[model samples]
Target chain A: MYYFIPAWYGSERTWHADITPWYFSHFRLEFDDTFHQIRLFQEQDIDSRLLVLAYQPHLRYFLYRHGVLEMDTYSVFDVMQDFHNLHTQVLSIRDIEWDDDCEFIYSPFTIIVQKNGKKFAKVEHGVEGFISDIQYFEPNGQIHMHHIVDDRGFVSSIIFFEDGQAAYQEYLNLKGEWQFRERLKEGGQVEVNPILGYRFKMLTYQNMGDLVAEFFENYLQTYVKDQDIFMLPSHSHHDQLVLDRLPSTNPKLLSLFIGRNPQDTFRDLDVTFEKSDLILVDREDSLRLLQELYPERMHQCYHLSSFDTRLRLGRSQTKKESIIYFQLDFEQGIDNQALLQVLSFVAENKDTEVIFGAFAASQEQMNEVEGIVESFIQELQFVNLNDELDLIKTLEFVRLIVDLNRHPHLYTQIAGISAGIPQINLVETVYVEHLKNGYLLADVTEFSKAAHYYTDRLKEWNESLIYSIDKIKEHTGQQFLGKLEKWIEEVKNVK
Target chain B: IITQRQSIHWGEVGGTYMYGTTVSYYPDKSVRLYNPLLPSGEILKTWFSSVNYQAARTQPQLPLLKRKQEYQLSLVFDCQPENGVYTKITFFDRYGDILEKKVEKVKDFIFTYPEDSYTYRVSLLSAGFESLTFYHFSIKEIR
Candidate 1:
């Protein structure tokens, strides 16, 4: 028999088991004899319940053979109920006896106890069966300690709890000596609780930037490699937009462009990478498209969708009339039909005015769209996408002035408090999380509540980011760099 | 009949290593008794006598089943040297020859005798050179 106990690894909670006398299959205790730790996050409670239930069938049969009535046998429902109440109750046979004002005496063949419906402490052998798995609960219904006994009536595996935590696991070892086993600790070498679940090492970062970089690295390592990297590219500029924004250092990464326009050439967009492959689909059936391509390896794929339709809608809904920002080579002629479709759709849906942004708008184009503007006083704003020191600053400036921008996923719900603006954001990939203080879920459904929650969170995020950057430069950064350099040196030597 | 807490005595006068050893109470519910095997050059023998002894001596009319059916002696303890040492619980008659003797490292041992009149004595004897620590030792009779 073995004992299982749940404990926390860093901030993530996991389970571990201590085994004794070669593990039995019937007993659902997951013994991690190697790391000596079981890492089950969401499944911990479920597994624990399953273990408690495994004995129920055997218990029922045993009681039935002895002619004990269905009501007489300890209810499986009661055991399940007790297990659920374990987090709140003190679990120990000894503690339960005192709390419930009952008494129990165990013999080789039977357990005699006096409880609610039963008489005084001097009752007859009430449960005429071998006491295998015994558990007790405190008045508050938290587990104090639970155990499984051997054939000789000795407790084989047991766990002691303090409050709700599994403080200790005491079990009979191979040689039959009761030993105190080790508990899982933070920063210990343990895997994630399960797939798609991450257990951060709580690594010391020199700055907020370093933390962001580590976060990006973790995502790339977890989701990108040897997987079909889904890319939703815009019908514009350089390959560097996707390449530079990508988290991986490797250049040979294979990718599938889901829902990309068929007419767009890879050379014009500059995605000339040999590994790049495109799939033509008019509608956004990305979820279905993902399954079609590399169906067997679906679990390994990472879908990086760039746009969320709600940001624009939220902005439009918040401001009855909002400006629409667009940026591409104005010389190639903007997607007039796409622009007209959006403007027409918004006008029909709500009383909205659209300020169409055109970079270095030529007199001829202005005259060409004169009829479009005459229908509604649309402002032709002249813009430059690259005047700022950094792309992030430029995007920030654009977000500040523009009401509703292209690639709606990038901007937060907080519209810049400016009148008229001309700007567009080309890159709103994962790295945008680093630049922006935070991104609210473009949740139009829970618009007001989400907006308020995100506004408060953004304030906290800004303050924490500032403090983290300062702290890293002064102290934490140097320590991390020292360790990182040492690690690099060791790795280089091994190589 | 020993149904509740009983008066007890430590056999200090006849003990070899009793000079360094002492008996202490843990919340009055249990007892902690140990002898640290410091190079004293003398092996130690520890023992305690309880109320059953006084009752057997004074009361002669008590029935056998009512007097002694079985008494549960439980201890929550730990032993050192890891081997060759045992805590002995002996139920003694009037003459003091071992009526029933139990040797265990740390466990509950029950004693039942044919005769009703007897005293219970728990002793600690070390065969090896190591200290023994007993956190708590308790006794309550089972009818």
Candidate 2:
């Protein structure tokens, strides 16, 4: 009965590089929580995980792709309106007839449409390699209709290019017919026409948020039971809109504050947290951060990880010896002096190999990062690692994991815990317990002794391994469901 | 010519082939909770049939010729998710009583001596489609 309302305001997904992981939870509203939460909830028998708003053409595609088609993800737009049927099951580039004098060419990312060999439009592709959308001369004129294909391999929406700009867009269903139309004005405000049979009062909405609020209100009224829980993520444009519009009571809600960060100044977000019966955060540091800021509302806050991974001891039975891994973040440059120190220690321990891993589209970027080091320790080898199942399978072979960046990623830390690998980081982390599991460097200078401390002693390394699997166990769904039962009881007691 | 995929349950039998319209028939089914409020329209979700059905096969006669005998059951099939395949073999004792139920993602198993009348069962399930297709099956005495 627990549902996630982790909504994204954008029409398509993008990597919000500089923000914390939760900003990408909307990525879940796209791909099922980066392949974790819904799987974890389904593991614990909590079926409906996604309650999304906005026009999500990729819903059916992702559900089937992720093998989670059984989990019914509710889309507000799809509920009230239907996709006007296009006769064909799919829309192909060949279906469009270019002008008689025009020539055509193909690129890896797009299909170039030309009028007499002059650029007229370009069609782009989606994640699963299907035509996503097309824009005029790549656009601003021509009154041409640009088709936006869903990953299911068909046009799910279309845009109208007018006199000097793309004027408006009409969202469609799988069958490729217009269900609703919306225009984006200045300041990114959305003005959408009310789809017939679903509207309450307005013929047109001032913005998409208002329209979504009405659609979801009707959905919850008819379908949601009194025992059902809405886990609303804080700072969501969609969730905040619906929560603000709900009647004073009846729809029990939980505030998921993972999307909130230290510098957020939204006044509406403040009121949303105050309204929820219980507040949940993804990690302990987030709970501490919230408690530090809102001492008055700390009692309502509880911490739980959305990911549930099996707790296993790190395995060292590999062909290589003393393998240590470091994830070099693309945005945060590595501390070369400190990085050299770890490799210098590797030089002394001839059996050791240090690897620098970067999630880059190009290996050339990592080759440039490899360009940072002085050859004093070049006699000792440090290298780059290749990448999916290969990733987690590779993690188990690692003796240690390291990340020295500002606001380091929780993934490697979480991965470190799941595989029971000892780790070191420049930032504060619950994944590491100073000396118990892993090391937290006060600054980059301490990477030398930190590497030697665990790698030097195999037994001590596994003692740290014990700490990781134990800490990782605290973050399971069983732990979450029990805490949820206790927390909901408290919420009911207060009521 | 664009040849599309076919239904998983296509060409299956009526009594022997088990493809249920509703989730309840799967018994072991994980239902897709539909919104009753939505307008009545049969939305064609292919996965509707993908992770959508369950089929169970019982080898030999239901009223077993030799109930106490140990039988080796071999079933091989391909699945989208190697892990999502759920294969369970239940050994029924004298009459319809179950002696043991062995569960795994495996494709084959053996029912040990139940000391009374014994036979076995195999059930294929899903709708992400953690889908399936059986390649072969055999049930023979292991004496």
Candidate 3:
């Protein structure tokens, strides 16, 4: 049984520091869409819900290796530490080969938010519903930075939101000259900014605010229809993703703002998503606004969600258990007032069972979060869904094993649009990775939320296979902490 | 768990490999490892030699070899150099365990162990894979 508990930034280490806190605003004791308690981004007035469709299968494989699947689980922090074997190395484990090797950090400085490809945020699953909020950017604009992994930024499904409503979402080409701004401290941190105060007319969006291809055609009238230059934004549910549609497959942007590129000198402008929603405000400023509006919420509260067209027990069961899973990301700049607003919202729903799914958290901190929801939850299923893989597909991914064994030529191919041999190989590499981590919880309410989180973003055709992996590293230039990491490391270290 | 052995003390010229089948190995053919050359490098077929291989028509009739299907087998080899020592490598009875090992050492070794195959790991202090090797394996019945 998987036991998940709730905890905050200081408490959760693996996912807490690694995960960007600007994504989630509200969460609850829950499972994937199939579970009874569906976690909402927040008790936001919007009716949008996030659900998992299909992602790289075998997401539960890691549980078997860690010995958590067979027993009652503990808090989220412990689970992450366990999956990473964090507890195995005592805090006293200082200056040792195992310590240094095990000390390998994962996205400690950045947090990634991802969304599924096949699924779209409906009126019920609005934009704010299935989006992960990153916690680190301290610049201007509603930075929806998307990794143009491929030529265009068309990896996973990314959408835009306004007041918790779906402004726009899509699985389209994110090609366009992007304007990038980087922040550096005085003296050493200062280097000629690669994307410093540079405005490139690369980003373009469809007037419909959804279809990415159409948006590019309309925006770049004469700007060389590289068709390779689609615009990809970063507002997603997953940390890393590969844009399959773009001519270039390797597009990894930290964040971005979607809408008309006002920098260009084009007349008769075709605008998308009302100017107000597309308004680019400094992320820091936006955080302030968010903090002011929701004083009780954490200043850096992040909320995200993803929904699939597939419904569980549809027309078959009397009581439909349709749930929208959303996570509240908290890391960078999360203020106390912001955390309060969020806690207050979850506190209101005290009658039913609330499942808290957190990747990082200690047993004590989880207990504290549990205390808050105690008034609202009749029973709480605190399931710790860390980065584990499913076992069923580990057998199927054996071919990948054979391929690596035969051809140990490890090469880091350049990221681009269109699927090529390197890109496809990398895709396969990513799939094998997910399988190695899959280890599902048998009798628990949920298995691995992180895997389910990634499953929501992979391509439809790829997801259907017996086993598949998401190219988060190639797609977004960001790495994930799941079994994929282990697989890739072994392949590289062995060769 | 039966203990099998395949010791390759190659003669100056070409030499034949002697392999004792293990318990639970339903040898459809022969299986063996030869040429103790590079112990830590890539586990390749070009580095080994083959002996015999034949499949069985029926199951083993002998009580001792009945449930314990025997195939041309050998010990789970481990080499301890004058200065180095490594972890023990094990054989599995299922495809999953084999798959795990394959992924763990994707570039060094390949092939999934048979589901009903039995081979445990132990340290072989002086035996190293520096040359050619082979697994003469096949399934057979005990009459």
Candidate 4:
């Protein structure tokens, strides 16, 4: 018949029944002398410890005052909204009456005393909101529940283990009627209901990747018209293959082969470029490779000769003569200590020549770096490439050198793996999966160990490359070609 | 093709080898590289310095040195020298030219330049018979 509850923000005057002992234990309340009110305290505090100790005695006193010889309790609470002192509120629960069976006559009841309880009872809409707060118990004494409304009165954004998951979201239209925007089936099928304007029914997909692929194709169809598309095989062939798979006929596709080494030759591409009509070659042996499988619009590609990877194709015979290139940004404040750490690492391991690439964007930055390095006892060569294309050439050139010499490719960025060139990184980022897929060597001092690891696993990299190329080839034959023609016809009619 | 490069912060996670020198992160977030020694035998043999940083720009606002605004500069230092010891602070431009030079025998020296663009070099040294110490080095921007 009596219930004692902690004074929280929401339960001040509200009747809360069926509140489990598990929910009651979550609050560690302390009486604030200044406000003469109870507030939540952290579990580790002495105040919280005292609160736990005081709870049992308070419950016993509540039962005695109500004249109950036997008690059948579901939840506990104190209904005093304006507690000037603790004594008045603690003794107030005695007013509620008990039945002949010593059980409360009401199965669902509000904890507030009858004197002023009707004011809040008027606010209850359906079954006093207490019928909604129900908990189920399992054979193992574990608690199961539908929802948890915390101190803030939210239907709590939390997950309950015993209660399974459900997909429920709704959108409203201008007419104030509930409209179906998205739906999830029990069997894991997802549907996105489309609206009016273009007359397309729906955009449905199984997973996020397929949705993204479709979105990208839609964007290309809407925006990119008849512009010639040039494909640069830079990062990985995954994105390029996605674009390639989308059947398109209007815009002519051209693959630019920027060759600086033997790997850049078309012979390595082999089966990857069977249907290619426009292939531009840019290698020294372009004439020979051109006659082999090169296209009609092909020309000899000229690269930044200064960025020739062949120049750094071997390991340094001496540590003093060795070079380590650091790729950095000039616009931001360079962490002085980080650079020093790398320098100290280099100094301890070997007195190598330091090469800083893309030092700064302006004269001011160049001066700052030069000034800082002056304090240290070392010679540094600063390399600044004015354009993005030149920068790519330089980085790729470094990659080539690293591949050839088995030098540890160290950088702040996720260095890509090309031609079995392993990279070492100290900083981790969200895009680390790409680096891992490229077989990046993580952390420091283990640089040599990672180098050896990649060296042993070089065959795996080659195999992966072959497999990826095969996937692209598999999706690029007559099937896609037919779609291209059909899409072209549709596009012509639309225009 | 292009990879986003993460900036590396040194001393935060790297090994620190202090050869009779002290390095601490100040309240303002700038690191103080210090060397303290008494005037006696093997005093000159102990030199405290930092490893090479990419000679770029001076740090912004910290104890010891910083470049303020477009051109203003202020350098604060604690240079206590005993016997014949002295503290030297040298300023260098982008071309490695010494823009300004100062030698002090006293402590708590505040050097201010109204408007200038240059890098600063500070050190504590003795002629084998003077105690050398650095209590603090701070730099700020002058309005």
Candidate 4's iRMSD: 34.8
lDDT of 2 at A102: 61
Candidate 1 versus truth, CA RMSD in Å, comes to: 32.1
Please provide, for model 2 over A155-254, each residue's C-alpha lDDT reduced to its tens digit, 9 standing for 90 to 100.
Answer: 6567776664667777665544466676744434344344442434566666666666777888777877665666665544544566665444433455
Return the top candidate by TM-score: 2
Give the better candidate number (3 or 4) by TM-score.
Answer: 4
Model 4 alpha-carbon drift over 4 Å, by segment: A1-190, A193-203, A206-210, A227-275, A280-495, B1-143
Candidate closer to the true structure by TM-score (higher is better), 1 or 4: 4
How good is model 2 by TM-score?
0.65
- DockQ value of candidate 4: 0.01
Better of 2 and 4 by lDDT: 2
Across residues A1-495, which tens digit of lDDT does each residue of candidate 3 receive? 011111111122111121222122333221221111112111112122221111201111112221112222222211111122211100000111131112222132222222332211111111111112211111222433321111001122233334333333332212222222112111111112134223222333122112222323332333223312121222222212213222232111111211112222111111211111111221233334444554543312221111111111111112122121112122322122323332343344432122333434445655665565554344324533322111111112111111111211121111101111111111233222333322222212232222243233334223322221233222222231232234333433433
Mind giving the per-residue lDDT tens digits that candidate 2 earns over B6-66? 1112112333322333222222112222222222222212111111011211111111223
Q: Across residues A385-439, which tens digit of lDDT does each residue of candidate 4 receive?
A: 5422233344432321121112222222212322223234444322222333333
Candidate 1: which stretches are off by over 4 Å? A1-375, A378-381, A385-428, A433-484, B1-143
Error of 3 at A457 (Å): 31
- Fnat for candidate 3 (0 to 1): 0.00
Q: Give each model a TM-score.
A: 0.18, 0.65, 0.21, 0.23
Q: For candidate 2, what is the DockQ? A: 0.02
